[PDB]
Amino acid sequence: SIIHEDNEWGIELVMSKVSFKITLTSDPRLPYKVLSVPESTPFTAVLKFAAEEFKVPAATSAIITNDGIGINPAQTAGNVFLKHGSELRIIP
């Protein structure tokens, strides 16, 4: 959120990241993916990226906590990390 007046060259600030370990619990191997995500990333995009990694449809998948708590995807990844930590499940 620092305003750069004249950035003609297109320099970008790389944002702080949060990491999630996401397990596909419908597969008996319990495969997991660890995603490193810029903090402001909408959680909808994390769901999409995870679903693509597991080759399941994003439209019919949801991410929940390891305690079974639903996660409103209309939130930033940073806020999801602060509230729920890193250990998440992807499910139908």
Read off the CATH number of the domain in which 66 is found.
3.10.20.90
Maximum alpha-carbon separation in the chain? 53
Identify the domain containing residue 27 by its residue range.
1-92
The whole-angstrom distance between residue 64's C-alpha and the CA centroid of its chain comes to 11
Contact status, residue 63 vs residue 24, Cβ threshold 8 Å: no
The whole-angstrom distance between residue 57's C-alpha and the CA centroid of its chain comes to 16
Report which of 43, 40, 4 is spatially closest to residue 20, judged by C-alpha positions: 43
How many structural domains is the chain composed of? 1
Instruction: Report resolution (Å) to 1 decimal.
Output: 2.0
- Cα–Cα distance between 50 and 52 in angstroms, integer? 5
Cβ neighbors of 73 (< 8 A, separation 6 or more) are: 42, 43, 44, 46, 47, 63
